[PDB]
Design a protein around this ligand. Sequence first.
Ligand SMILES: [Mg+2]
Ligand SMILES: [Mg+2]
Lengths: 352, 367
Amino acid sequence: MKTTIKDIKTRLFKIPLKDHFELITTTVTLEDGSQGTGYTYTGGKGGYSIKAMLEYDIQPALIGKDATQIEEIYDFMEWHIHYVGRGGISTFAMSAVDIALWDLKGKREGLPLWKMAGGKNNTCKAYCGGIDLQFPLEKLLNNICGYLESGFNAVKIKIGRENMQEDIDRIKAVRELIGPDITFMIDANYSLTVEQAIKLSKAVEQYDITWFEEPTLPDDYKGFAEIADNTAIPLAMGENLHTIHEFGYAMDQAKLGYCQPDASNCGGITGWLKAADLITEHNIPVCTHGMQELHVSLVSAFDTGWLEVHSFPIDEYTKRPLVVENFRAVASNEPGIGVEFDWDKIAQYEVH
Amino acid sequence: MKTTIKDIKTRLFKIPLKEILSDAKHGDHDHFELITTTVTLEDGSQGTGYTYTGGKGGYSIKAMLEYDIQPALIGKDATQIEEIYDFMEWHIHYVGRGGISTFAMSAVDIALWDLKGKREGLPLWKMAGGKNNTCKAYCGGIDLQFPLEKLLNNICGYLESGFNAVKIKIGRENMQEDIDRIKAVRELIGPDITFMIDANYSLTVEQAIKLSKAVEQYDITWFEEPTLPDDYKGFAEIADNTAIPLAMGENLHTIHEFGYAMDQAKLGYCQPDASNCGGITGWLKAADLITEHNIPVCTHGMQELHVSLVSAFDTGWLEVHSFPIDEYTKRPLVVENFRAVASNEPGIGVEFDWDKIAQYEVHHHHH
Ligand SMILES: [Mg+2]
Ligand SMILES: [Mg+2]
């Protein structure tokens, strides 16, 4: 059958940073020879685990099937590895496959992802964050000036030192530099307690902080609600939510103002849409985490939230690095997911 | 340090099953998968823990252990099982919060507890709570495709094996079939045998209600995973409209997820599985939580390790799973007057017959 899945190949790359992040490619070949690649990525752990799952648990089960029936295959995968699923490694792996199918669906239908995911805009608000917690203060600000002159009107910094006061300092430093008009967000990486967080959001309400990202453990939905009810800075989370249920819980109880689903680990573009469709119902901004190359097509598709521009140069090893027109990420009109890996450049980082 | 971690060796086994086992959502089952993890110290000390699966995930569990966790563990004090376990959570967090990650963590932590026992010279049931060395138990079968005669004969075997409680799978497209097979099992075992059911998260809320209603008359001790274990509210709705107590737990991989259950699911019985919710340390954290909500601490799979744990808390039941891990152990499960007998050797009470399972080792290989 024309669209029947004939082969699937999955490669793992260790790519250096500035220490290193993982990239997992997954290429689906069809009957008529059409190809499509999807991917997922990591901050350094579980690359092998993801590739093992794909290569033993999921891929051989997928050979034979019709690549056009993507919801079907998605659903099938979720039940197939359920015992060792319900999030974790299993969802990275699922994403990689689902994205490649979306890619074939794009090339097949001659449509770019931004129109495929709903097509409400081809451009979107963006903002830069860094792996900046350990950074000396002057080093941080010189970095942020960099972002502002590259063409971005919003920045973000990590907070969460045992020395709380050092954090309120760095937040005030950045607001001085950027002035009234540039947007400011903070991300705590679930290092705070509820009461620790409430301390900090109270201490910096004055700096027009646009959101407080993952203030406490993301598994603490009541926690967030306790925070938000003692706080006037909008709460944000999503990175680490891997299941449409986990997003369900977040809307139901977490009282969030901004939600950031990551297509690479909440089950690809099918899952991401599940999440974004949900978030929209709750009249909340649809934002994203990591994977700028892909997500620009997705944020722009719902036109409502921020595209996070992450440190990982995943886009530096593709054909089209993120494109900015005045303070806005621009999405590719090329059919597919609008991402296409520079195979020759990453080939040196492939592993095993 | 004399109990620093030296080398940690992890093995995969694809162990076949005497026959094909089916249930409502996992399809078929011709083998299960075993993962063994041996932690060695600076004084020759050797502890070994394990986890299992229904045939999927083994390579993925070995991979995670071999690259992401094992190297980061070497040169820590095996005594600090609290610290090493707290460490593993944050270490793989980005690709964690359950799923493959907690299987991984469980094998390692159970090793550390096998060391803590051998080093302290204590049996698990004392370590895990002490409150008893024997415990109630029931036989589960992954038996949904077995025609009615085979299911009954097979059940006739569980009674004759010295057991006073049994469970059967339900989840057929035709609800009537499941009703007629429950009615049958009750008619075969008489009033005195405890009887449970298990639908493997295969029903809609409406279906679980209709089903539970049409069979409450057969004195069903609990109703295991009627619906998705992520639909806590779903569990609420079912419990609010039916009499037979609800049970879940075997798919909950996080202390938070058990929290959600106790908070919302309105469960009568909960079933932590040490193999996949953070080993013995996590199991206790969850058993403790299950206890404070005045719910009987039961158990899923891995009969030879849990017999210690259900005994130790002495409030719930021990499942005699259909993956006969204990048969490739040196000590098969021991039943005395319808009760499970916890091992008294120091450690976890489990020591595999490496010679027997040796023929079943798998090894990665190359694509
Ligand atoms: Mg964050
Ligand atoms: Mg069950």
